Amino acid sequence: DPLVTTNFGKIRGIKKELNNEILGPVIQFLGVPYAAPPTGEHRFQPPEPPSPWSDIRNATQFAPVCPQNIIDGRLPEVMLPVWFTNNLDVVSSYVQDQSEDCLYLNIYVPTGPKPVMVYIHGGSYMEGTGNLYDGSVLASYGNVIVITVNYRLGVLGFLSTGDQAAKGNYGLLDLIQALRWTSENIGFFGGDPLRITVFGSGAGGSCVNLLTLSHYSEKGLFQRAIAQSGTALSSWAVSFQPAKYARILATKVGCNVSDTVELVECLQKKPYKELVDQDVQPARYHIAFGPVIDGDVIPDDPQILMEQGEFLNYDIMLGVNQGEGLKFVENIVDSDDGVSASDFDFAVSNFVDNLYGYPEGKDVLRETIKFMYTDWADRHNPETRRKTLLALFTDHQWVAPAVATADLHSNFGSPTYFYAFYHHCQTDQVPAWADAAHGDEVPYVLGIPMIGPTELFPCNFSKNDVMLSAVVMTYWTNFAKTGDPNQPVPQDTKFIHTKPNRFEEVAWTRYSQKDQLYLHIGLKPRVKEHYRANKVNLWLELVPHLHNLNDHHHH
Amino acid sequence: DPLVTTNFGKIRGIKKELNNEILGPVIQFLGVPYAAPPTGEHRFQPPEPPSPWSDIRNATQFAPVCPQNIIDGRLPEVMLPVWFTNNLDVVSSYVQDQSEDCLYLNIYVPTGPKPVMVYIHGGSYMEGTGNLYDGSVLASYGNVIVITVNYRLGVLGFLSTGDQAAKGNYGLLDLIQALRWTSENIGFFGGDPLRITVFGSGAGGSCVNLLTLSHYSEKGLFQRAIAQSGTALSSWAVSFQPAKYARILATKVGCNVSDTVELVECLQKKPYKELVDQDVQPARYHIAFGPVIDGDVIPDDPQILMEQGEFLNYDIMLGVNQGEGLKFVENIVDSDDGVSASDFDFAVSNFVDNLYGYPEGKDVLRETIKFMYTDWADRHNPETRRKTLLALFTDHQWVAPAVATADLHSNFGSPTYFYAFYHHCQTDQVPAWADAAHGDEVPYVLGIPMIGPTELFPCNFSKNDVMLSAVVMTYWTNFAKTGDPNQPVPQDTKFIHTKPNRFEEVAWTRYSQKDQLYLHIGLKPRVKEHYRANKVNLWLELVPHLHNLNDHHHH
Numbered sequence A, B: 001d002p003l004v005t006t007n008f009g010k011i012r013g014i015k016k017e018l019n020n021e022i023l024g025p026v027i028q029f030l031g032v033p034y035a036a037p038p039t040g041e042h043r044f045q046p047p048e049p050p051s052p053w054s055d056i057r058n059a060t061q062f063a064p065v066c067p068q069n070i071i072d073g074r075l076p077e078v079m080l081p082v083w084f085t086n087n088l089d090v091v092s093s094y095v096q097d098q099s100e101d102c103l104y105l106n107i108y109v110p111t112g113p114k115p116v117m118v119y120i121h122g123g124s125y126m127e128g129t130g131n132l133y134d135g136s137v138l139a140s141y142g143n144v145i146v147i148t149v150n151y152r153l154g155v156l157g158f159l160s161t162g163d164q165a166a167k168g169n170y171g172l173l174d175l176i177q178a179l180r181w182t183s184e185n186i187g188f189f190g191g192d193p194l195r196i197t198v199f200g201s202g203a204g205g206s207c208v209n210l211l212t213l214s215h216y217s218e219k220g221l222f223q224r225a226i227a228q229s230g231t232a233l234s235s236w237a238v239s240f241q242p243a244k245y246a247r248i249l250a251t252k253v254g255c256n257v258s259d260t261v262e263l264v265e266c267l268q269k270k271p272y273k274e275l276v277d278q279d280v281q282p283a284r285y286h287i288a289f290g291p292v293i294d295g296d297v298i299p300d301d302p303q304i305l306m307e308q309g310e311f312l313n314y315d316i317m318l319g320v321n322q323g324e325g326l327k328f329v330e331n332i333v334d335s336d337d338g339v340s341a342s343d344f345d346f347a348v349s350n351f352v353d354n355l356y357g358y359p360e361g362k363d364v365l366r367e368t369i370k371f372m373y374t375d376w377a378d379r380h381n382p383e384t385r386r387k388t389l390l391a392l393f394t395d396h397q398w399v400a401p402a403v404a405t406a407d408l409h410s411n412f413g414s415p416t417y418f419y420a421f422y423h424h425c426q427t428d429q430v431p432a433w434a435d436a437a438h439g440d441e442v443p444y445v446l447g448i449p450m451i452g453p454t455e456l457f458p459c460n461f462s463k464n465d466v467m468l469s470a471v472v473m474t475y476w477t478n479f480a481k482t483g484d485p486n487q488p489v490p491q492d493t494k495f496i497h498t499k500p501n502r503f504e505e506v507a508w509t510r511y512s513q514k515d516q517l518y519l520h521i522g523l524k525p526r527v528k529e530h531y532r533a534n535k536v537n538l539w540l541e542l543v544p545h546l547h548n549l550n551d552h553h554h555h
């Protein structure tokens, strides 16, 4: 009978055996309230502490998830993890039970104080749940406590009128409240509040970075951050026109009045289902509801905050996957796995126009970008065209921003580590020609290969996948334990790996803007330098110069 | 007693043994007049046939060379072959005996009709002599007749008033006259007038290409062309402001009168040395005296003629050397063999402004070129900077023009072959870090390694140099024999090679604009595709687009 007494009352967890003969069991505390329900007058308001209870509260099953709709095709596939979009039937079972009363977290405890890794999920800020990420294997394997969190999503978590009526960022404030709850109560579970690492993939990674830029993350709250395939600098990390979308939403539900306070009060009267089901489309590659620059939680544009080093110095780990942008080209690839020269020019031109605006003069940007992403040493290959087009989207939305983020963190003294993920397990839902796509590193970080194929992750993981997952978890948990991916657990070959550990002699060197060393995570691992340096510098150095040659405007 | 009766009279040659035990001797006919002396009223006039003689004329020693000055530092080192500029003391001995009466050619005959290879020398159109190129080894080894030619140089060979007073191109007309003489008389020496191949390096290669664009090269005159490191499309292949320089020269010698006919008549009265010794400097990277677009010999801009396929369909072979542009950077390299970021920016910017003119608006060209030639994967390496800067000059002045030439020839049906020369023998006069420079292929084509170091080519040639020279001569002479570098002599290993022939299994595939297959000539030979495709397309496609973004002007 796993009982723990927290500052709010006694809680009962549940022991769970893992589907691996080597891994020990864990104790799970599911559906733990970390804040009061954000309902009634508390909708569109910062989270309040949870109410205490006098008996023993059971935490043996997941609590309802935050309101969302993932079955009507409103989800931006180019932004969400492929494992999620390709397995909607299973994902749906995890979010079938919903409620506005959804501020709960899950704790996985292995059977001195242990490091705590807090996972922040996120695809587009509109959907998901930490419940989708089983932290059992990571906890048991790395001997760390793993926590998954549910924070307010979409409209309920991010609506903002651009003024005092609704300041936005409720979902981020929930994450901060979950971190405060953890800091104050995890010791009761055997956790170390002085060694808290927050990690997340995709929009979850964006959340991680945004938290490091907020003064609400007081010194000492958490110590390290791991942002996988997600930054605060991408076009879809922040909502820059919140008021516009708040009013479009209001108009659709019959609440669009002149006064913003009355508008919000009206929205607070609506059944949450009504707000969630409306179709509010943002510009392509951008978001409608999400983090906003309120001047308080998020003090200014993240780019400015980063350039000016407006963040505490956490230990930082970040990276990207070889082929993040799969969904960007998957639909235009012909039956021969190739992309035509015409589809290529069309795709590149439209992407540039949406991100940089239409030129009011003679174009130079589109012409230059098409030239740069054309393999002149093999310009006739339709498959190579597919590859370079995919690389363009990957470089622009993930690689460039990640490098810009790494450069600034190291420049300002944050111990930084960078990785490029070049491995994955292909399911029957992904093209045979595809490389690791957005979200593909998640199963490895969570140790799914160690417990075999699951409903959520059905790929038939190989022994090499198990070995690689073990390697990744060792680096990730070493980082959680010391802020150094190499300490204290060496990369050795043990029965758990099932195959020789190919990283035995690979020390993950710290990243610096000068050498830019990074870990190439794959079956042929090694530390390399200047990840895709040519394309990264094209986007960060040359393009801005060319962009300023003309006046541009959007629509 | 080597006697031959030509259409103009009997000529006596001289037998010559070669410094190689395997090679047979050759009969040399040196100083054979192929035209009448272009003196008096014949200065600045097309060449006339030579006068016949009734006795036996001796052709056992070189005739005086055409007027020139190579000792006062007026020679543009960036344009001339390195072996020439680095060994002026020896070169000077070959041009010490000069005369305006200089239209003579040299014939090398091996001891059915044999193919004839006519070598056209040329550094900047102002200096040199075919006498510098001993065709003995090529003739003996390949069993072909080799001819070297002396044509009018500099002022005497190319002065033009831009009108009828002096139409220019006298030196080119001399080459045509030498080819006509060869066509009509080489059979008397055992040569085949139906298999005449013209070849040349540097400005000599430019001459070769210009001849293919002239209507004066009537169908049947010659059948094949080999242009080594030289085209008719480079900035220094043609003189575009002839009148301007004709008048600057006239002013310097006291002949600048208003009437162009009177100006020319005055120049015709001057001692040739007076015209040769004047310092007439053209714009950097351009020429003052050289081929001009007269609308007759050269009907229009070579670029236009090439785009429109205005040339007969010859068998063509063309190529470039790995590091042509050595002299462009050699002087700015520090004692550490590197180039600073500042010197790099300065060199690139100045080169671009000279070739493209100064922009009258915000620059885009300089910024883009600097970005393209920066190795972002090793941006801190000063030696890499040296290499990329050298590559920039090489790509622009030699590679791009050669590829443009090859593409057009193949597009219009000319059987085309392309090579990249990646081997050389370093003398103690060139930097240890340098790769094959401009003119470095000459010793190999001429078989110099077979006879050991010479006064002109003092490098201590290795066994591999001998082997490679043998390989090159086989490809070149096979081309002369059949128009196909692979027939009829196979690339086998014989005692003459001294080392195993590394090209035994390397068939030189024909070049096409689609596959752009070329022969990589080096110690690790093989046919490759799309030589430096990225940089070539940058210059041929992207740059022209960026150039048109602004109005540009020169000074």
Ligand SMILES: *[C@@H]1O[C@H](CO)[C@@H](O)[C@H](O)[C@H]1NC(C)=O
Binding pocket: A012, A056, A057, A058
């Ligand atoms: C809590 O769980 C216990 C053990 O399964 C059960 O007996 C009880 O009915 C549940 N509800 C509570 C909190 O009493």
Ligand SMILES: *[C@@H]1O[C@H](CO)[C@@H](O)[C@H](O)[C@H]1NC(C)=O
Binding pocket: A247, A248, A251, A256, A257, A258
């Ligand atoms: C909501 O009302 C305001 C003021 O009446 C108006 O400006 C706005 O367009 C309306 N919202 C929309 C987009 O329909």
Ligand SMILES: *[C@@H]1O[C@H](CO)[C@@H](O)[C@H](O)[C@H]1NC(C)=O
Binding pocket: B012, B056, B057, B058
């Ligand atoms: C030509 O060469 C021959 C043989 O060396 C020599 O006898 C003669 O004097 C030379 N002069 C001429 C033109 O006969």
Ligand SMILES: *[C@@H]1O[C@H](CO)[C@@H](O)[C@H](O)[C@H]1NC(C)=O
Binding pocket: B247, B248, B251, B256, B257, B258
């Ligand atoms: C030569 O004379 C002409 C006309 O008298 C003049 O235009 C030209 O500038 C003179 N040549 C030079 C460049 O000195």
Ligand code: NI
Binding pocket: B358, B553, B554, B555
């Ligand atoms: Ni000017």
